[PDB]
Amino acid sequence: DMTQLTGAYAAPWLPWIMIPLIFYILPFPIFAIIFLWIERE
């Protein structure tokens, strides 16, 4: 409760996975997809 991130709401495992996914797992694939879109000839 006071030593780590918890959640007293419904599905508290959702921020446990969504914040890693949104902020440091998916951005480099999205940056790579956008990079290939703006460099293609």
Partner 1 sequence: TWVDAYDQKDIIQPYRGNPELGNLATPVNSSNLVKTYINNLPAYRPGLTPFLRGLEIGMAHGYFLVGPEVVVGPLRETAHGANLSGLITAIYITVSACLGISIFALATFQGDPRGAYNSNSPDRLRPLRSKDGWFQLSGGILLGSMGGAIFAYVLLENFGDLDAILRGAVNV
Partner 2 sequence: ATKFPKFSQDLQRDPTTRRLFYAIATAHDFESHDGMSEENLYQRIFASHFGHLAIIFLWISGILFHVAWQGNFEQWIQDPLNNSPIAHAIWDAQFGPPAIAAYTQAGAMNPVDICYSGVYHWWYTIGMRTNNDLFMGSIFLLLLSSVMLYAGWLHLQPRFRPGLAWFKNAESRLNHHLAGLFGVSSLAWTGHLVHVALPESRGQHVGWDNFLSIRPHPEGLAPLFTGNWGAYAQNPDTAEHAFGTAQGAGSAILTFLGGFHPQTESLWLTDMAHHHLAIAVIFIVAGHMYRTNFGIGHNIKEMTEALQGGHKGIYDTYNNSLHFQLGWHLACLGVITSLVAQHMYAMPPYAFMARDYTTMSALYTHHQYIAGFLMIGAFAHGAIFLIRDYDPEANRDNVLARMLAHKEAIISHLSWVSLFLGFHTLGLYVHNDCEVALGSPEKQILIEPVFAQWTQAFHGKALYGINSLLSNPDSVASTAWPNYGNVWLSGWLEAVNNGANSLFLTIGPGDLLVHHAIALGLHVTTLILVKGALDARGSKLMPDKKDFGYSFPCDGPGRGGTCDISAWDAFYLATFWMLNTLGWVTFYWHWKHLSVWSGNVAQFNESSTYLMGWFRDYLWANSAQLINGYSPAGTNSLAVWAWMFLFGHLAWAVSFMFLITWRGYWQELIETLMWAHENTPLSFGYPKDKPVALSIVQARLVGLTHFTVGYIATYGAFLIASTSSRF
Partner 3 sequence: MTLSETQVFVALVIALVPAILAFRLSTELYK
Positions touching ligand CLA (CB under 6 A) are: 14-15, 18-19, 22-23
CA–CA distance, 33 with 27 (Å, rounded to integer): 10
Shortest spacing between CB 4 and partner 3, in angstroms? 21
CA–CA distance, 28 with 23 (Å, rounded to integer): 9
Q: Which two tokens stand for residue 11?
A: 């599905």
Shortest spacing between CB 6 and partner 3, in angstroms? 15
Q: Interior CA angle at 12 toward 6 and 13, to 5°?
A: 105
The answer to the question of residue 30 lying near partner 3 (CB under 8 A) is no
Q: Which does 28 bind (CB under 5 to 8 A by kind): partner 2, ligand F6C, partner 3, none?
A: ligand F6C
